Design a protein around this nucleic acid. Structure first.
Length: 54
RNA sequence: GCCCUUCGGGGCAUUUGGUCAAUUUGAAACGAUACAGAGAAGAUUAGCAUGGCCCCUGCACUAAGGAUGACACGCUACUCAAAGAGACGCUACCAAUU
């Protein structure tokens, strides 16, 4: 049942997950804020020829 | 304030900063309501694009979606003739039933 408080291994796991997730989310959130504060550039950087566009 | 002094003097430290704390008049946007109302030459519609002073959602400013996201569907002389054939064109208008 409940009573096991040996939490250091799982806590470790989530710290290392955070280590990897910081560069990805700081980039993603920075781009969220770029859209929010200067707007979306819609075209201009060219779109690739994907499968639906071949 | 402190320190030094040869008691005359000298030293240490040196220029912040975000338009006020004040919501009518220097800029928020839905929803409700009213209304209308969805592409491809009969009917019904899978979409993929194209162009940018149209954008939205998205990390994607090298996905995807938004009705195939929408827009598109008005308007329409102007580098501009030549041949040969006509013209009471360019003037006048005119005297017998028995």
């Amino acid at each position: 049942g409940p009573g096991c408080g040996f939490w250091a291994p799982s806590w470790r796991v989530w710290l290392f997950f955070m280590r990897g997730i910081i560069p990805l989310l700081e980039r993603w959130l920075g781009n969220l804020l770029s859209r929010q504060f200067e707007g979306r550039h819609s075209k201009g950087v060219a779109k690739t020829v994907t499968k639906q566009r071949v």
